[PDB]
Symmetry: D2
Subunit: 116 residues, 4 copies
Amino acid sequence: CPLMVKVLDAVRGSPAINVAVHVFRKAADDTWEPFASGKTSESGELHGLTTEEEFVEGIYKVEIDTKSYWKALGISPFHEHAEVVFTANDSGPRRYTIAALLSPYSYSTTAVVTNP
Amino acid sequence: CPLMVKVLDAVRGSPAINVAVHVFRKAADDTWEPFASGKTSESGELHGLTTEEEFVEGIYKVEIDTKSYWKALGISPFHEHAEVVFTANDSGPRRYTIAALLSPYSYSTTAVVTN
Amino acid sequence: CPLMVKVLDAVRGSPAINVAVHVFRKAADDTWEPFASGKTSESGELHGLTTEEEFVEGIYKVEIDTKSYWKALGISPFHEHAEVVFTANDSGPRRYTIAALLSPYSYSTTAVVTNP
Amino acid sequence: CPLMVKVLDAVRGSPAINVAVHVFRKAADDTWEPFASGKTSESGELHGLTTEEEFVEGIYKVEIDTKSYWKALGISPFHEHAEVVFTANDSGPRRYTIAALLSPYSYSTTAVVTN
Ligand SMILES: O=c1c(O[C@@H]2O[C@H](CO)[C@H](O)[C@H](O)[C@H]2O)c(-c2ccc(O)c(O)c2)oc2cc(O)cc(O)c12
C-alpha cells in the first residue's frame, strides 16, 4: 500500500482501534478535496486507502479523529483531531506510513517514507 | 495572556526561533478566520496573541510554519506545517500553553492548561 | 516473539538500522544481569531476543545505543543511550513491543503490551 | 542554574507536581554516585540542583520517578522510571534543561541547551 496509517494509545499501551481517518488532497482551486477514508483495525492500522496509480503528486491532509476515540473511553481530550499535512510523490512514487501516538492532552506524529 | 505558544527544535536542542505562527477561530460557516499571529522569539515563545476579553469559547487552530523553519536550516522536512486544533472551554483552567517539539519527519504537540 | 524492539529516525523518516540493543534483567542481588542483545534490521526491528520460557517475571532494562547511531551519521547527539526499564510478566506472560523514536536532542519511547 | 528539570503530564495537560528526581554522576569505577535530587514544584520544575562550580564535565543520569507519580493518580504505568543519560560538555551552551513529557505507557525527553 503506498499510504498506511498506524495509531497507538499511550495511556493503555495498545493499538488505537476503530479510529476514523479522513484523507484529503489539495485541488487545482486550493480547497481540500476528499481522497479516502477508513477506520483503524484491531492492530491500530489502516491499509487500502489508495493505489500507486490514484496516489499522484499533491498536498495531502490525513485527519485522525482522536476526540471521538478518547470520548468513547470516557476521556475529554484537548485536541479535536490530529492532522498531518504533507507533499507526497513530488520526486516520484514513495510509500508513506503516518504513525500517531495519542494521549488526552498530547499527540506525536511521525512519517516513515520508503522508496520501492 | 490566555494563549501562549512554545516551539523547540529536537535536532539542535534549542528553542525554535523566528517560526511563524498563525491562530484562526472557526466561524459559523465552518471556515477558519484569522485571529492572531506572530514569530517565535529567541526563547522559542510567542505571547501577546490575545486578551482574556477576546479569547472566548470556540474552536481554534494554531498553525506552526515548520516547513520554512527546516528549509532555513537546509534540512528536508516532511510536513507542510504543524496544526493544533482545540475547543477553548471556560469550565477549565484559564491559561493555554501549546508546546510543539519539532523534528524534520515528526512533531509532538502538548497542551499545558493552568489556573 | 514476547519482546520486540522497533527504532525509528525522526530526522530521516526511516527505520534506524544497525542500532545496538542490550537487554538486562535485575538479579536476586539487585544488579543488572545481561539477558539478551542484538542489532536492529533494515526495518528498524529486533526480533528473537528471547522465548516465552526464558522471559520470566522480573524487572528488565532495554538499552538502545542511540549515541553510536547518530555519530555514524555525523551527528553529535545529547543522550548516551535510550534506556527503557519495566516490570514484565507480573500478571502472566505478555508480548512487549518497545518502540523508540530518535532525534539528536530528544527521544520518545512507547510500549505496546498484548495478552496472547 | 546550569541544570534544570521540567516534567509535564500528557494525560491531565498539566505540570507533573511532586515527582521525585535523582541526578547521579558516573564515577571512575563506572558506578552512579548520588549528585543532587528533589521533587518537582507546582510548575513541574526542579531548579537549584547544582552550581556552575560543581557541574563539571562528565556523564550524568537524571532519574524521574514516573511510576510513583502514576500510582498516586490511580493509573497503571509501564515504566519503573524515566532515565536520561548524557555527557556535560564545556564546548556547548552553559544551561541544560531536561524536559520530560509523561504518559502511562510512553515518555519523551528533550534537552534544551542554551547560552
Ligand atoms: O522543553 C519543553 C518545555 O520547556 C521549555 O524549557 C526550555 C528552557 O530552556 C525552553 O527554552 C522553554 O522556555 C520552555 O518551553 C515545555 C513547557 C514547559 C512549561 C510550560 O508551561 C509549557 O507550556 C511547556 O514543554 C515541552 C513539551 C514537549 O513535548 C517537549 C519539550 O521539550 C518541552
